[PDB]
Design a protein around this ligand. Sequence first.
Ligand code: HAS
Ligand code: HEM
Ligand code: OLC
Ligand code: CUA
Ligand code: CU
Lengths: 31, 554, 167
Amino acid sequence: KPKGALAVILVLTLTILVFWLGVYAVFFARG
Amino acid sequence: SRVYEAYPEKKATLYFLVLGFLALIVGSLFGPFQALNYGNVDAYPLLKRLLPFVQSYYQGLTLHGVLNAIVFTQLFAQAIMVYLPARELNMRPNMGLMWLSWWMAFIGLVVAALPLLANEATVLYTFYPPLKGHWAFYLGASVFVLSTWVSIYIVLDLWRRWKAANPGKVTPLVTYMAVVFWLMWFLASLGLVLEAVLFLLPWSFGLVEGVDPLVARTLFWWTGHPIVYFWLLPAYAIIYTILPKQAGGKLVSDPMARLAFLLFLLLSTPVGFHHQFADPGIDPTWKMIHSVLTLFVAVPSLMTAFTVAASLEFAGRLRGGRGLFGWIRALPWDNPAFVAPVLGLLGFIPGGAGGIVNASFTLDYVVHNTAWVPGHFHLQVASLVTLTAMGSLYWLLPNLTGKPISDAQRRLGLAVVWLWFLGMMIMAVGLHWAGLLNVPRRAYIAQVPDAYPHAAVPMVFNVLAGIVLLVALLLFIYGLFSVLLSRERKPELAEAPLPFAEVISGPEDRRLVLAMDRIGFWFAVAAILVVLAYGPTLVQLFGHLNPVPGWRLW
Amino acid sequence: VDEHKAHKAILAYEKGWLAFSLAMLFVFIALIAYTLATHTAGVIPAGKLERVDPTTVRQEGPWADPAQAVVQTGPNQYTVYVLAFAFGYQPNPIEVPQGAEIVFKITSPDVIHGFHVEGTNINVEVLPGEVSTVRYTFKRPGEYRIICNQYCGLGHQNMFGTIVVKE
Ligand code: HAS
Ligand code: HEM
Ligand SMILES: CCCCCCCC/C=C\CCCCCCCC(=O)OC[C@H](O)CO
Ligand code: CUA
Ligand SMILES: [Cu+2]
């Protein structure tokens, strides 16, 4: 299995989620 | 040289590349001063003593954006996406058209540069009406961009000559990537060509009194999204088809690479209302439709992440690396041609995450026109695209000139790409954090030093980035001219083949590649998506034109 | 073999990643659609074309007297006519009550400006010849800064305004 390639897309997925949910939270705090 | 008589395409490719790097150097000089500005340090009195034609922060910012993001990126794309396919097919491009494309780019640049240097077009690289630039800027920029229409013809010619001599054969991979790239750019370019011919040129010559700024922006952003995919795809072509060989491996899938490029042909153009979420007079229904299509244009990059990571892991295992993370240490970290694009890909992770936030309609009201947006795009174009172009010099320049790279020049190259990468990462922290504190983009904030007290900590990052990138830029200048102006030549380097990767094939591949080789069909589908995405809004706008007078406020 | 095994294992996991990718993007679309059905959507500018002549907006009609710019249009609703110009905003200050719905009608007599209210989601481009219409309810009284966040010429970095929200 491409375990190394899996580790990269996990880090990419967590980066997307922290960015997106962080700004979603900001948007409601300002709303 | 007998090599230039057999491969005159080497000399023309070289003139594109060198003109591109010269534009990058001149535009980049302003970068460190802008970073210091976003650190609340005003160094413009010093810059004005060095370059006394600079009248303002905003003239510097215009030069920065035009030369780095329009001129350097276009000339790199014209070099790579004509030369790589020529060499893969072993066929000569039409050299009359290749030299015409170069002369159009050169003349377009000279004519646009004159009013930019004279402070007659301080309108930024978006030139939004009713700010009214000098006619020579709009004419020069038009001629510069229309150079690319000659490049399209050159590659469609190569492809048609190949097909006629190889009936029944699927397009080879690099030629496939270049054909769908150039056809996407044809469709993309029409927004800006229409804005220039219908509005900006007659307006700037005084033939019409006013321009509708809402229609002007709508045509601009038709081209203004896909142009960033135009910048990106030459870097992806190198990352798919050359990087795996430089890493010690192979490309793990030809069809997954073709499919990423096909999705960019379909999805790059019909999405530009993601630049207009904060514009009046555009129905929110259409904004939501462009938001959804923008999220889909992320898929080919999410796919690229997996296909490239799997290829680098394959190379690391081949070279002896074991475990979860041992494949990383086994890769050639002593080779700047390998290191530069791989660091670019690491910064592209947070760069892409920021883009997905920007695309998400209502979330854009948090970040629109703040320092967040420059934080995002320096990770995409100023890091991945630029570092991939800097790394290419270690294998492309010897191939074009026969000039060897010394072990010393190799080591200096490693220092340049690490400092450039690290400088871009530090600036990204500063700009994203300042954006969330409501610091605006496009602003000489160092002239209002008490206006943003909340941003004191991220401002320290912007100062540190300005210094690091100034050092990287000076080392880059020294290295590039060390190579170009060296006397030694070894013509056998000039006749060596390019380092194209081998591919691992599977039983699937034949069937997938035939369906994707129907380029006439996919072009039709791409065209119709642009009609449906733009047509209804544009009918509305052109029916209700409200032209307004021009202003000079500089 | 090694290569052929690796190729089959790589494509197998890539199929899973692409299904996961699609699933995640679909969940983001659902979370965006939710914002459009709440009060937080009032900061989206009106899609209607409302044309005005930038050459007469300071002479005739609702932007011509800044002291009569705040108009009660509803039992808990005020409409404010805001001019963004080189280089300032009128009225200055804008004075509105806490807890009411505010409809901002912004235009420009000259070039494009931004209208970004610090601490809020109000963040709208202002085009000459067009009216930008957005809605917001202020929950907290105090002073809110307006920032010009669209490059509008040499006075851009100094272009600020003031909203005063009264208890
Ligand atoms: C090359 C240049 C650019 C690329 C690429 C780019 C990508 C995106 N952008 Fe963007 N952008 C926006 C949305 C996106 C989205 C959805 C993507 C997507 O295409 C991004 C998808 C990318 C990914 C999902 C990343 C995948 C990750 C990869 C491929 C790395 C893997 C790493 C590996 C393999 C390494 C492993 C190796 C080891 C050794 C471990 C939006 C709105 O939706 C705005 C307007 C915001 C506003 O308010 O003005 C915007 C604004 C800009 C502007 C400013 C324009 C201006 O002046 O006003 C520029 C110049 C720009 C450039 C670029 N942008 N963008
Ligand atoms: C030494 C390298 C660099 C530094 C320190 C740097 C820094 C900056 C900073 C701080 C800004 C924001 C200024 C503002 O909003 O007022 C900026 C804008 C920009 N930079 Fe860079 N930059 C560099 C290189 C590049 C490169 C290589 C590219 C593209 C290939 C690029 C493209 C841009 C663009 C398109 C803008 C926006 C212009 C506009 O808003 O009109 N930069 N840069
Ligand atoms: C295999 C399992 C399948 C199912 C898994 C799917 C995951 C669902 C995710 C999000 C739900 C979205 C619901 C929207 C609710 C939003 C609530 C919110 O954010 O409201 C706070 C705010 O303060 C209000 O004013
Ligand atoms: Cu008004 Cu910037
Ligand atoms: Cu875009």
